[PDB]
A = this chain, B = another copy of it.
């Protein structure tokens, strides 16, 4: 097909990459003991 796979597949793919990106940053915490 012209597209990589499907509109639903592409959207979920991007929504997943960012989801783990922003969610990971929020979970991560910087501390200096």
Contact = CB atoms under 8 A, between A and B. Distances in A.
B26 A27 contact: yes
Number of copies of this kind of chain in the complex: 4
Interface in A1-31: 5, 8-9, 15-16, 26-27
Interface of A is mostly: helix
Contacts of A16: 15
A14 to B, nearest CB: 13
A8 B9 contact: yes
A26 B27 CA distance: 10
Nearest to A19: B20
4 contacts: A5-B8, A8-B9, A15-B16, A26-B27
